[PDB]
Write a protein that binds this ligand. Structure first.
Ligand SMILES: O=P(O)(O)C(O)(Cn1ccnc1)P(=O)(O)O
Ligand SMILES: O=P(O)(O)C(O)(Cn1ccnc1)P(=O)(O)O
Ligand SMILES: C=C(C)CCOP(=O)(O)OP(=O)(O)O
Ligand SMILES: C=C(C)CCOP(=O)(O)OP(=O)(O)O
Ligand SMILES: [Mg+2]
Ligand SMILES: [Mg+2]
Ligand SMILES: [Mg+2]
Ligand SMILES: [Mg+2]
Ligand SMILES: [Mg+2]
Ligand SMILES: [Mg+2]
Lengths: 339, 339
């Protein structure tokens, strides 16, 4: 599956490049370079979800070459939405590596020009949708869906950054209630809801109950995925995950610190206060010792088992009339992941 | 005109704020703050152009309250597109002030979080269009128009930044041919074409000849406007323009350097080579002395007279069947501007 999906990328590149106006040639070469560094190297769960789900929702005799091509292309549109966000995210989080190579903005010669690079990747979504789905009854649905997903994710990031000021203590806002909102908005909508929802619209499924039902399962699945992400920031292998963690030094409202705070003694509270949110490596080292000392890896492994069971109960409840396989495929893909 | 337009801004703010989900309250407060700092303080030529042109194209008996409200709102959508771009632009150009206050990203407490702030402003466009024009026959036209304008402007910025590497000499690419492309894409489409084109679509004017004709006049008018902008970077009053210039130190392909290069002796060429594109204040001072020594202020004042006459000749040719007043209003607004 992955190999077929991933191999469509050069057609994606070729169409967006074929826009040679030989005056903008140099900016089009620059965009090619940006697509290849930034869109390649991840898992492709989002883009493959668009494709798998489409096949599962459309009768095979209606899966002609042109409509499967549209499915691949909308999958790559979710991959570009992702790239757009990660490139910007890496800048704002002072990150070092992404997908096992240095973050694009750290490339000598690139710098904060990557800000325009990220906006350019976002624009490619709508060019792709124009070029392949313009004459489709779902065209506007997809456009409004991508735009709403972008907005939601920018709201969430806004709350991610607010709650994590450089230079200021902020343990008072690290609550479960707060964590849930941030992750709903910054991750769950675009990573889980958007890809399945894209495929539904392409299969002709636009009912509000049907979309709201898919949303019940998929938002929960997004919360879970971000929680895993927060655990891997501190406790994952950067050669495996492809990325160096920064949450503690960026003062972030990570699942870990939330859980630390509800378990911590007043003296433990103080350790976190003196040590969290700062670049000093020995202060980070202390926070991690507090985490390991409170058995948060075990706390997480139990949360991961329970959350998973609740997700499977939501599928039993809300999957119909869609095949459970649609959601089971994704769930089983992200469960117990170390990457 | 301006006062009525500018006074609609709190309804704009109130609708985008009314999205209180009291969980995202803090990100919505943050967005309000971002609208006020970044959308206010300029000339409003773009947003007022949407409004003036709409009134001039729609029979008065059809200018009801709801449709004028839609016109104001689409005008503010062009103002937000502008804000989005300037905030990002100021970061990538290492600028200090904007509209007579420090650039948003230089505000203590803000920093590169302004990258998400800019994306959030862009998203507001599409929320506004959804909220006010969803049930209008021009809705998709406006959406595709805003998205295409964004893409064009990102292509141009891409070429602006490429041609202006930090650390590297690049006088060999500072050609008229190159300058024209960069400014077509980075300025002319969104600042001139987009606002009039928005108003046409809202008046029911979607013919391709009619849009292409408006484009002939308006792109030329955009080139002219960027040329003025480049002159004011070096030769304008920062208390008037509201912004400190950075072109020479950012190594930019400004109208001035292009014109310098076609007039320069080989020894003058060398002065520019040793001095252009660097932060050192005495090197910038030398470049400006080379400019004044070649009479480029006078070269510009003559270009400004000639270009203007050619623009007025294009209006005579291509304005019909639209009123010439539509384009004359804009032209006369930007001509001989010191701000
Ligand atoms: O931890 P984050 O929220 O920043 C992250 O997961 C990215 N992201 C961005 C939006 N939602 C998630 P990453 O760890 O890749 O840096
Ligand atoms: O000179 P620039 O192109 O950067 C500028 O005009 C902004 N801009 C951005 C896109 N087109 C123009 P500003 O002088 O405001 O910094
Ligand atoms: C939302 C989060 C946690 C950001 C990373 O998403 P992935 O972990 O799916 O990253 P890639 O496969 O796209 O590299
Ligand atoms: C395209 C350019 C030259 C950037 C600034 O546009 P304006 O000079 O119209 O700035 P504001 O009135 O929006 O402040
Ligand atoms: Mg982040
Ligand atoms: Mg991050
Ligand atoms: Mg993370
Ligand atoms: Mg610039
Ligand atoms: Mg600039
Ligand atoms: Mg300028």
């Amino acid at each position: 599956e992955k190999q077929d999906f991933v191999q469509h990328f050069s057609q994606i590149v070729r169409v967006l490049t074929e826009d040679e106006h030989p005056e903008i040639g140099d900016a089009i070469a620059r965009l090619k370079e940006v697509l290849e560094y930034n869109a390649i190297g991840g898992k492709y769960n989002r883009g493959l979800t668009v494709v798998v789900a489409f096949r599962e929702l459309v009768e095979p005799r209606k899966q002609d070459a042109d409509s499967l091509q549209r499915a691949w292309t909308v999958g790559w549109c979710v991959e570009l939405l992702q790239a757009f966000f990660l490139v910007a995210d890496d800048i704002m989080d002072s990150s070092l590596t992404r997908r096992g190579q240095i973050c694009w903005y750290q490339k000598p010669g690139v710098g904060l020009d990557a800000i325009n690079d990220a906006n350019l990747l976002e624009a490619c979504i709508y060019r792709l949708l124009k070029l392949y789905c313009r004459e489709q009854p779902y065209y506007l649905n997809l456009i409004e869906l991508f735009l709403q997903s972008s907005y939601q994710t920018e709201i969430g990031q806004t709350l991610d950054l607010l709650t994590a000021p450089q230079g200021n203590v902020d343990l008072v806002r690290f609550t479960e209630k707060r964590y849930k909102s941030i992750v709903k908005y910054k991750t769950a909508f675009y990573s889980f809801y958007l890809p399945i929802a894209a495929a539904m619209y392409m299969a002709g499924i636009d009912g509000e109950k049907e979309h709201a039902n898919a949303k019940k399962i998929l938002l929960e699945m997004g919360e879970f995925f971000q929680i895993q992400d927060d655990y891997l920031d501190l406790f994952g292998d950067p050669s495996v995950t492809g990325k160096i963690g920064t949450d503690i030094q960026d003062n972030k409202c990570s699942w870990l610190v939330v859980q630390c705070l509800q378990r911590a003694t007043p003296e433990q509270y103080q350790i976190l206060k003196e040590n969290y949110g700062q670049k000093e490596a020995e202060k980070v080292a202390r926070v991690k010792a507090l985490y390991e000392e409170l058995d948060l890896p075990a706390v997480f492994l139990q949360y991961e088992e329970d959350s998973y069971s609740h997700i499977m109960a939501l599928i039993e409840q809300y999957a119909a009339p869609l095949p459970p396989a649609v959601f089971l495929g994704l769930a089983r893909k992200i469960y117990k992941r170390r990457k």
